[PDB]
Symmetry: C2
Subunit: 474 residues, 2 copies
């Protein structure tokens, strides 16, 4: 017996500025670390970068019109820091602010709730040149000034804010795996930058309380809920280590302002724990958010990993199924393929019940409302004669995840909204354009840039029907 979706449920769709906007050097925009990073040969598939992307900076009016046709209740986007402060910490760029002002007015005139994401991985290169960006406490007050600038200019028209998007991703990929700017493989640096990012998150939530007292703000965590492989006690203990190290490590800081103790002690024994100053715990414990943002795609199953066993592993960005290899941390846990779910061709788990599990774990541990900021299926799309993209695969994935959300709401989880990823096709950070996520097909591939024309996929009309029935018809 299912509860209905609440009447105010934020049926949404999401983007990220570098992935969508283009206009990388217009109206005074400074360079970001991704402008620099993606132009380095070999970082991105076939050299694709965000110079143009899908050109949303010039075509947003067309884009919002398609949102209004769909009847989106909400649209989640990120503000590009380097459009607002080209130097990170210097003088404000009114043209940068003007674009987001025009975007929000376009959204508001069509009855769409704007959800503004403060940071999605594009710190200005200048801050990285001046003091190493997230490795320096100086970024805390420069990020605050940036945040406060947006709060004063948009706080009367934006109720929902997200601080740092997938902080575990841009910290891990940027400082442990070397896949994102700064392209570093140093765990000591990774956890120092992570700690400073935690303090930045807390400082801007505390500013938000002052500048937007009637608004709602939270971080957004890239949450892959951990599973034990079986009921072997050694595999359950691996799951305890994995859920605490991969998930509590961030969410406990967001919710309670404390790192988990066992994980901390493991890092301490390695010489990897971050440097703490007077003031840190009191700041982190005083920044309670209104919700936990959740970006969800898959669960992860783990098993026992001996002290000499698997370390970092092989990722699968080609799309040939079966090429992923176990990654893990020796002594604690290593991943293993879950034999009870299917995977995509990138070996990502297809596990909509895993979303209910993860929503239940956040409610049960933190008692926080949840805003689902990102969920989606990336796949190749064929444009067929008659402007028809029959992405039944995407509909089937979104249907099952929305169905499990309703069960979680029926369990008593407070889910504020759901932002599918993504509204239009967009540039992936590293693999180009062919793994598409959008409701709206964008006419370009890896080689030919074509005209970037927007085409409504079959999933666009499915989700239009979802919204008008408030999820009653899926």
């Amino acid at each position: 017996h299912l509860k209905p979706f609440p009447p105010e449920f934020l049926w949404g769709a999401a983007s990220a500025a570098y992935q969508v906007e283009g206009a990388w050097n217009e109206d005074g925009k400074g360079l970001s670390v991704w402008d620099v990073f993606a132009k380095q040969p070999g970082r991105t598939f076939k050299g694709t970068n965000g110079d143009v992307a899908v050109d949303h900076y010039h075509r947003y009016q067309e884009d919002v019109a398609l949102m209004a046709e769909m009847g989106l209740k909400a649209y989640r986007f990120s503000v590009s820091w380097s459009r607002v402060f080209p130097d990170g910490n210097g003088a404000v760029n009114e043209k940068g602010l003007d674009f987001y002002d025009r975007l929000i007015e376009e959204l508001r005139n069509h009855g769409i709730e704007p959800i503004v994401t403060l940071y999605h991985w594009d710190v200005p290169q200048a801050l990285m040149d001046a003091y190493g960006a997230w490795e320096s406490r100086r970024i805390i007050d420069d990020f605050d000034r940036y945040a406060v600038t947006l709060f004063q200019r948009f706080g009367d028209r934006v109720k929902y804010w997200v601080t740092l998007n997938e902080q575990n991703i841009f910290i891990s990929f940027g400082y442990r795996l070397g896949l994102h700017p700064p392209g570093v493989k140093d765990m000591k640096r990774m956890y120092e930058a992570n700690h400073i990012a935690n303090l930045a998150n807390a400082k801007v939530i505390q500013s938000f309380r002052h500048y937007v007292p009637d608004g709602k703000i939270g971080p957004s965590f890239a949450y892959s809920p951990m599973y034990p492989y079986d009921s072997r006690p050694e595999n359950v203990l691996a799951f305890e280590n994995a859920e605490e190290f991969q998930n509590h490590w961030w969410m406990d800081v967001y919710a309670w302002g404390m790192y988990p103790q066992a994980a901390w002690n493991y890092l301490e024994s390695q010489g990897l724990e971050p440097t703490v100053a007077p003031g840190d715990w009191e700041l982190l414990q005083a920044a309670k958010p209104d919700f936990m943002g959740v970006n969800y795609y898959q669960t992860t199953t783990v098993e026992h990993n001996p002290p000499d066993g698997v370390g970092e592993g092989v990722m699968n960005t080609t799309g040939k199924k079966g090429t992923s290899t176990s990654s893990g941390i020796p002594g604690l846990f290593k991943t293993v393929r879950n034999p009870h779910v299917d995977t995509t061709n990138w070996d990502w788990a297809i596990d909509p019940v895993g979303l209910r599990i993860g929503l239940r774990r956040i409610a049960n541990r933190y008692q926080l409302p949840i805003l689902i900021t990102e969920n989606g299926l990336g796949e190749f799309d064929t444009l067929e004669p008659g402007d028809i993209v029959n992405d039944d695969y995407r509909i089937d994935y979104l249907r099952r995840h929305v169905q499990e959300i309703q069960r979680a709401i029926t369990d008593g989880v407070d889910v504020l909204g759901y932002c599918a990823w993504s509204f239009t096709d967009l540039l992936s950070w590293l693999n180009g354009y062919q793994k598409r996520y959008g409701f709206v097909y964008v006419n370009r591939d890896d080689e030919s840039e074509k005209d970037l024309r927007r085409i409504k996929k079959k999933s666009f009309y499915w989700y239009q029907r979802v919204i008008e029935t408030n999820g009653a018809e899926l």
Copy 2:
């Protein structure tokens, strides 16, 4: 490289008054609910009862001398409420307090720390008669009067105190399964009595802060940590349901003063959630314990249970292995044999790693120190001529659990002490005498008290060596 056991680690052993004392009608003692219940035909194996038990009431000097020979650092025992208040809430029976005073003085004269359990299932029958005992709010102030009586008489000599022993057992066996007094099978009444017992726990922790400001106090929860059968998402969701419904339901109230929400909502949908009065949440939230007491014997593995599925199961009462069957809650979860561990003859899982997992979960969720108030192996013992009892099976079980305690300490779990169940053999509530737990064999069976003579088992000398080496030699 393991951490050592900390210098003042409480190497202990435990009992419970009804199981050990006898003297059921001496020196002014009133009837308890167990005096009455165990004399009803069919309630206990072979009609065994606590009239004599192993006669610790008269033989406490001999028993304490054996604790000194072992070198016990702490002895955990329970106070019989009906010795102190024969009618539960009238005038104090000084001879009742004088026994526990004599006992505490014997312990302290031999260097043994007393750990006093306020309530181990034996509320006076007069309170059951007057208002139904734990089902009535009247018990909150009656329990409080009793606790403060003990705090004022013994607080100068007792630092460690336990409030309610295994509230989840005496409430669920007493009101849901009807196996303990008052023998009721009614889930609604069960959760009402459970809520009243939560308030009584909170009230006496509050009183304790006034009367024993330098003491340490906590409840003793009967903790069986849940495992999912495998990585099937439906079995992991069963584990989420099972851990919250069986474990968080109690420990969250103990630690945070709040029931978990998914469980509460499920009870509400069934008309089973308890009645909440004004002021209840404030009392419950303001009664933080110094430690979580943990009674640990086994883990429990669970899997999906369809809404038409398993409910009450068969309980192994005889000692014939393989006779237990699944128990669960339809629609939420059901138990299933863990194929990766062995089980005793009573079908209890032998899972020392589970104790590390359980200690880690409590640290990770509540950040509380833990006092392990019960752990042991119940088995048949053979008395061999020469008064020799070779219980290597017990040594092996205790050894592997103490080993995992030290791994948990090395992880960063603050464990205050370890109380093996039990010091001497004693009466099991339902299963008679042959399922023995003691370091010290007591010569009696279900048919005859014989001479009740005390006989040191092999495990006595093993534990004596454990304590002498502070656990470095196991």
